[PDB]
Design a protein around this nucleic acid. Sequence first.
DNA 1: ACGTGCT
DNA 2: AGCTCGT
Lengths: 10, 8
Amino acid sequence: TXPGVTXPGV
Amino acid sequence: XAXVXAXV
DNA sequence: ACGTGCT
DNA sequence: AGCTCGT
Ligand SMILES: *C(=O)c1cnc2ccccc2n1
Ligand SMILES: *C(=O)c1cnc2ccccc2n1
Ligand SMILES: [Cl-]
Ligand SMILES: [Zn+2]
Ligand SMILES: [Zn+2]
Ligand SMILES: [Zn+2]
């Protein structure tokens, strides 16, 4: 996720 | 994550 | 027939 | 630790 907590996605 | 039909 | 991208 | 689709 995020970043943080990429995306999703990418 | 892959994009081979969707590309998410 | 395929896994992706930093805080 | 933290998630997501179909051409
Ligand atoms: C990207 O690596 C990726 C991996 N698995 C998935 C499953 C379902 C929908 C999208 C997905 N994307
Ligand atoms: C793209 O739509 C797509 C659909 N089905 C798949 C099955 C297995 C690998 C890649 C695929 N890509
Ligand atoms: Cl599926
Ligand atoms: Zn998979
Ligand atoms: Zn870690
Ligand atoms: Zn499917």
